[PDB]
Design a protein around this ligand. Sequence first.
Ligand SMILES: O=C(Nc1ccc([C@@H](O)CO)cc1)c1cc2cc(Cl)ccc2[nH]1
Ligand SMILES: O=C(Nc1ccc([C@@H](O)CO)cc1)c1cc2cc(Cl)ccc2[nH]1
Ligand SMILES: *Cc1c(COP(=O)(O)O)cnc(C)c1O
Ligand SMILES: *Cc1c(COP(=O)(O)O)cnc(C)c1O
Ligand SMILES: OC[C@H]1O[C@H](O)[C@H](O)[C@@H](O)[C@@H]1O
Ligand SMILES: OC[C@H]1O[C@H](O)[C@H](O)[C@@H](O)[C@@H]1O
Lengths: 798, 791
Amino acid sequence: ENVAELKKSFNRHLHFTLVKDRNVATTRDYYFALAHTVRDHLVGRWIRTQQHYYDKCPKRVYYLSLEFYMGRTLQNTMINLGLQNACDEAIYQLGLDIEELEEIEEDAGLGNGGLGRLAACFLDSMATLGLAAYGYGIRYEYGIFNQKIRDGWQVEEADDWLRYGNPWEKSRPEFMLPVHFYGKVEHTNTGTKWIDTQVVLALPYDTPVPGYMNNTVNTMRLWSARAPNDFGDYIQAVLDRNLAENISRVLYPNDNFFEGKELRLKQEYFVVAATLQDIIRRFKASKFGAGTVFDAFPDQVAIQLNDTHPALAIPELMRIFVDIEKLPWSKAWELTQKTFAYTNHTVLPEALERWPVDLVEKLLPRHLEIIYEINQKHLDRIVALFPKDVDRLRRMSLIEEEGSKRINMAHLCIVGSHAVNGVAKIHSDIVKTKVFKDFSELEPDKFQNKTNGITPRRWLLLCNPGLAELIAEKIGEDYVKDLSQLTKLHSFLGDDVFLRELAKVKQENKLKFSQFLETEYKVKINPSSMFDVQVKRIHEYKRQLLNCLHVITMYNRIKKDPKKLFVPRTVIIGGKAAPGYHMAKMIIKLITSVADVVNNDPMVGSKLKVIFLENYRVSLAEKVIPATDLSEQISTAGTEASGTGNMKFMLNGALTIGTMDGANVEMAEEAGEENLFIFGMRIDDVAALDKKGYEAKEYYEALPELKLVIDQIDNGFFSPKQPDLFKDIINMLFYHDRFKVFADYEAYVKCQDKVSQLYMNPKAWNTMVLKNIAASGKFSSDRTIKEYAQNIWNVEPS
Amino acid sequence: ENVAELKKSFNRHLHFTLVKDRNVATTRDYYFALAHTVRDHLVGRWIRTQQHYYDKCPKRVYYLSLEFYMGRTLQNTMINLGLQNACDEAIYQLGLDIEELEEIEEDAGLGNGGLGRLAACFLDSMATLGLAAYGYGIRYEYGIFNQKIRDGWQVEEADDWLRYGNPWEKSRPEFMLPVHFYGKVEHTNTGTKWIDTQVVLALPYDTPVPGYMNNTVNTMRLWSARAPNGDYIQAVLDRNLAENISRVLYPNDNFFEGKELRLKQEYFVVAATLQDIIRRFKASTVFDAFPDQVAIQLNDTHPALAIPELMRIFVDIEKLPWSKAWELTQKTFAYTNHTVLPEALERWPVDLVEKLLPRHLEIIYEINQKHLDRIVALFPKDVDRLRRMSLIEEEGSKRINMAHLCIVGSHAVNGVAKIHSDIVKTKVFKDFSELEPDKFQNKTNGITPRRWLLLCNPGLAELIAEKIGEDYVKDLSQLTKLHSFLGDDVFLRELAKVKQENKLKFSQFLETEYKVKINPSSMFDVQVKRIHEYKRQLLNCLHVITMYNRIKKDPKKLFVPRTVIIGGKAAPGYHMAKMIIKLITSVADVVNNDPMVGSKLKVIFLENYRVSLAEKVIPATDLSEQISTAGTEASGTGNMKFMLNGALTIGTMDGANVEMAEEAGEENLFIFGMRIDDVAALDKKGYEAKEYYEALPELKLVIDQIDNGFFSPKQPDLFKDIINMLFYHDRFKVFADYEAYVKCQDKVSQLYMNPKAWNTMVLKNIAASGKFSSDRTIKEYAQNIWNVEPS
Ligand SMILES: O=C(Nc1ccc([C@@H](O)CO)cc1)c1cc2cc(Cl)ccc2[nH]1
Ligand SMILES: O=C(Nc1ccc([C@@H](O)CO)cc1)c1cc2cc(Cl)ccc2[nH]1
Ligand SMILES: *Cc1c(COP(=O)(O)O)cnc(C)c1O
Ligand SMILES: *Cc1c(COP(=O)(O)O)cnc(C)c1O
Ligand SMILES: OC[C@H]1O[C@H](O)[C@H](O)[C@@H](O)[C@@H]1O
Ligand SMILES: OC[C@H]1O[C@H](O)[C@H](O)[C@@H](O)[C@@H]1O
């Protein structure tokens, strides 16, 4: 019924909004016109949803994050509004390729990976469960960089996703706010005043987050920096306005790594000031002793801290409460802890934020004083409980007195939050009992666990219509808003017809994605090959290297015995490297050197193909994932706090090869360990090896197939023009590898062999896939948000 | 009919486009919703007009300019579409204040004054006459600065007119183009190649220019710079450099500032534009017809690089022989001169151009050498002629006389007023006019009667139409019909009433902004335009003080009250202009707070003078100050604005003032002071300012008062700089016109006491305004330079 109206609406927009006609209209014009057509169906419910929150005043959730890895919005919006099939019909009748139009949209890559993607999935889940949630972030003019491979190496290009404009955002001018920087503190008899500061304006841009088929559309408020107006040399002054606006210019491209750069600190405070102000504003403009207001603040507001990035929010709330609202420290401190909650995402020391006191002193002087306060009161408590353990004092202080006095933002988060959480059982256990044992001892109840999740809308209905259709056609639609209902799929473990249909879906995905790989890359894809893929950011801990040592091992075997039955494979590895990460870039170069050697060897032919999937990102993850057979999740045990990509492959029909790390463990729990290809060392095994001391050359000497791979890389087999090109990798691998690459090699290759074995038996392979898919339920972000809402936010879904 | 549809359309937009409802909607939302509602009526005719140009292929006009002083678009659009009364009715019924909404719109102040305003008026006129014209400029993220007065001095604030977005513009992404900078030249056997350059992208933003009631809507294409797609962070941040090319408009009026970034802008707009033009031409042996399909008007010497740029494309990229290219180039370009002041003439240092545009310096040398070779073959002995005509000023720092580049690469050169074009032709460029007499022309400036009458003065326009018809809008010449009422006393009361309603409506503006209390029966004496020593706001300032002194001296003599209003911005780097602004505000403070003067004399420095504000004050003035030194104002357009709006003019025989005297009758304008020759005869004898200081009593007091501290007790010698310039370095003869000026001003006050005769002179002036319509100006451009037919 809306087909004819959608068509008229589309024409209305191409004309009035794009000022074009079917003859001089670009593909982009059609994209824009469709986006506007679809976007219009959001306004009604968006105005309504927000109006409902004002009248019913339910407790609000504020997901404060420096990242929001959103991807494209069009298709995602069409599906959550039950409009995709109608729009597809509309665009078809107009003679246009709906798929061709969706590809015009630029990804909103305002994230690095995992962390920023958890925020996006959470927004979609909170809207679906009907919660009064808001996401607050920074509207980076440039998100994570577009990645190119030139001469084998990664090259970074600016991701100006806003060049042609973003129809999915609406500037909210009336809500602009000032943010302060530098200045000095002046204590007076009127309270404390922070003066002589530089002001920067925050202009919020709202984006709607449609819940899946439930009339609600929430808000994602992203802030952008702007120079204020008040107050030769004139030109430069106008140009210098770029400095203030530089605060929200680029997203820092570091995954699990702390770079103590001033501009980054400015961003963290930036989003924190604007957000808290806006939140205090909404609270006061709502229906909810001289000071009879803020007492109810904790029962109306819940601010979730995504990692330690917005940690400044705690002392910032104390600054407003004490300096501006004039509350006693006691009361403010009380309300602060009842308001904030912290989520930890890593145990890697290089990923922990420790800002130098010097930097914070000249940038946020009033906040350094507040952190000292919090700390002193914090240590006074510790002393009154353990007056002799002096070592306990420095281990719990928010200030690392060592060499360069820094602020342990993590510790700041634990005291200013009533709840701290990990993102996976094993991870939260380590966060609770190991990393912050001194804190958990004192506040056992504080530390919790909330296993991560992914939204089945974007990661099933959207990216895999075929698989979704298959499922709904056997157990209903219910599984969408209750992924747990996927267990019903166990009734078909014997049905051979269902297994052929399962395989067919995966097949259509592989063929549709192979064409993507042939119009982009040189190589020719073996459609019957097994799709072995590893896609995620490039880290030594995620160990794309281990996988790389495997491809070379497979290569060597084929050349050695060029007639032995080899189960063909299309090994796909992808992910971006942080510009300043040298080993990660060397690793990317390695991978592309091998590929070039494997794909052009006539003796190997269709047996083994290697592809470095370029510019891995959200919209691209939606193409490759539904098309994979084997998922690589091989990080060293204890390095991955959880992982979500592992969850994405599981719901989409891929088997998993990986260690007992992060969420992999819980995946084994749900599907049955035997139903996953688990291998290598586990927690304790890594511990026992660090005690004894790691000596890599012994595995090099005790493992034949390994020695050749390593010799080949080091002698120049994969880089004749530069014989010692990978010397750095070899040196790290032999005397500085803290991720035990060689230590898992044998268990890995042995595991991989089992994988190929099973692949030759489609009946059994697909049987394991069903068991995996049927056990994916737990890993839905809806389940995750329910636990957050019930055990941390104290809010009710819907 | 459309009131009900406009209302539904308005709601449609507030909801779908602003995501608001009548309860949480801001005034700004209502403005945006209305703009969108009105903007929608433009799409059909805009698509159509452009489509028509493609099919009928009429010769196109390209107004290439660094400035476009556009003002607000809403109301202007409503009027040219015959939609204002219907929209006003729509907004009224919805319970909103239409006027309140229009005030939300930010002016598109991408201009300095006069020059940039002539471009805007021209766009409106070309669209009205139905010509296939396009305006090409730079979309400055920041136009001319908003001006504030703090502690009496001018303070500059950034004019971020794009903060909340501009609904009147549409990015045309598919037409982005690359612009080159720096690099080096490498001559090879394949032609000439300009390599190793830095690239900057030009992203065009189109804005529709609705013709007045004629179905056509033209295009104004404005370009913005973009970078092409923690050493990484800094590199991403450094993208600001490339984008800095279109960041700000240089705020200099009649002044050359040889800054590199400015040169980058000039080339920037020139490269993108020419490329887009070559593109459109090819998308319609080829280039032979180029001059008959394209006409590129150079607004001043700012886009002069366009000439060698066209030669670069033709020769380096299109591979045409130098001869043919050079031929087509001259047939394509036309240059308009706007000033004779040496400090306003562009002379770029060769060194700068060599490292920025090396290929273009070679092209300019080429043009020059061939140019001098011709001069020699005609006058093989006059060596002095050679350096006087060369495009390179060999002197000290070798510079490029862009003006001379414009004369040889253009088939037509024009001034903007008879007297001015005569000086440009016979004096400034006599050596060029001698060789190519036919080349130099005159095109007296004009102003659009849509924006400067129907828009800013609905009352006066209504009055006129109600007596002679609507015709005067598309043929201002028809205003002469107003002569039939010179005797009608009822028409004179009605004329005065209109002016009165304007003054009262504007006085309220002056009271909600400034401290002072306005005398509604006073005479509104105003001077509004950029601050220059040549425009002489100073002379006016010496007059206010003279009036002040007289009142205190004889606090009972019959003094014709006046509200002297002076306004305009000063270029940040112009010291004398800023001193002058300070002076004016010091006097005002001394005149407005003197109880002995009271309602007799008020002085106001009108802050942040700009287009939308000119639309308020002009319709409200009685006396217009146009007192520049004879020969300094090439033309002026503000003088034309006041004339059409009911103000009398006091001024010298300069620029367009002369032609105004011609049309209305000299006796009908308060002309005074020296004329061309008189200024010449005084420069021959040599100017000695102290003699007028000694020979003129009332003058000595004013000057003594300023220099001793009467207008600055806390800083007794604050204006020493003004005094020194006024006494030993004044090249604009301020003191030399003082006596003739004050004497003239007295006559003005005399006539003001006789409303019957004052209003009789106003009618004669308004009735003679016809010539000064930009429609008339464009017709002459179209017929004698562009060879295009108005519709
Ligand atoms: O940007 C929007 N409107 C707009 C309005 C006016 C203008 C300009 O006229 C400048 O304000 C530009 C964009 C917009 C509407 C909207 C609706 C939904 Cl559901 C989601 C995102 C949205 N963005
Ligand atoms: O900005 C416009 N459209 C637009 C198109 C797309 C988007 C977004 O989809 C981002 O590209 C925003 C605004 C626009 C339409 C229009 C019509 C006339 Cl008549 C005059 C000026 C105009 N500007
Ligand atoms: C899901 C996803 C991630 C996170 O997955 P990991 O394997 O844990 O790193 C990162 N980036 C993108 C683009 C994703 O879609
Ligand atoms: C008309 C106008 C001018 C022109 O002033 P002149 O003194 O004639 O050069 C300048 N600025 C604005 C805003 C105008 O409307
Ligand atoms: O918490 C979400 C994700 O954040 C980061 O990506 C962590 O490295 C990953 O282990 C975790 O799953
Ligand atoms: O040509 C438009 C205007 O250009 C310059 O501003 C001149 O100073 C002025 O006299 C002229 O009216």
